[PDB]
């Protein structure tokens, strides 16, 4: 079996962003982010934490597309969505987000694990590909 | 701050494969794999563990990266390599593998963290693109 420090290093090594949020009312707030999430978003740890992750969505709220996510979180189901998000510097990316409910023995709190991934390149590739297929 | 159970949930939730290996002679053997690594490779934990991970490489001896990885592991450097691997069922996939040395302050032994990303899709998209551009 594997100890806590190794688990930390497994998260720290990970390519995808990983985060944990605890529920605060009908919102969540980030309590942990890994290094890859910092790099992905352009924000430092200290800028990100203790806030709901929707700030990444920017000043726009899409069409409250997060409907599916809020449905799933409320219901205690995982989900995955691709969302528009914006780095610190304003540059936009497509973020493939997988959210996973956690059941906590230790306290009474509700936690969620998020795994996040830049999929811009792949979105663009599918687009370029469909364009050439159309020629 | 973050506890051990949630770290385990972060690794369990991970989309990429995560694994820990030990040195044994001039081999390394897996001692932990997450669920995603099962899915990725098609093998169960009990089939995988306690073996050097090169069996995934199949009948296809690469050279190139293997040397590079041995070099890097010996030297105690993290390293990253793309390599063809084969699931249980024979189907091939492109694995972006990053290996990270860590020393356990618990038992003073050095452990290797492996992160495995399936990058088949991107690779195939670039392939399909380069083919249509060739038309
Ligand atoms: Ni042995």
Numbering used by the authors:
A (entry chain B), B (entry chain A): 1 to 135
Sentences copied from the publication:
Residues 61–63 are in a loop, and residues 64–66 are part of an α-helix similar to other LOV domain proteins. The isoalloxazine and ribityl moieties of FMN have the same interactions with the protein side chains. The phosphate atom, however, has a different position, 1.9 Å away toward Thr66, to which it is covalently attached, by a changed angle of C4′–C5′–O5′. From the interactions with guanidino groups of Arg54, Arg61, Arg66, and Arg77 in wild-type PpSB1-LOV, only Arg54 and Arg70 are retained due to the mutations. Variant F1 displays the fastest dark recovery, accelerating from almost 1 day (1150 min) for wild-type PpSB1-LOV to about 5 min in the case of PpSB1-LOV-F1. Interestingly, PpSB1-LOV-F1 and -F2, both containing covalent FMN, exhibited a quantum yield 3.5 times and 2 times higher than that of the wild-type LOV protein, respectively. The effect was largest for PpSB1-LOV-F1, which displayed an apparent melting temperature (Tm) that was 10.5 °C higher when compared with that of the wild-type LOV protein.
By using a flavin transferase and carving a flavinylation motif in target proteins, we demonstrate that “dissociable” flavoproteins can be turned into covalent flavoproteins. The elucidated crystal structures confirm that the covalent attachment does not significantly perturb the binding and microenvironment of the redox active part of the flavin cofactor.
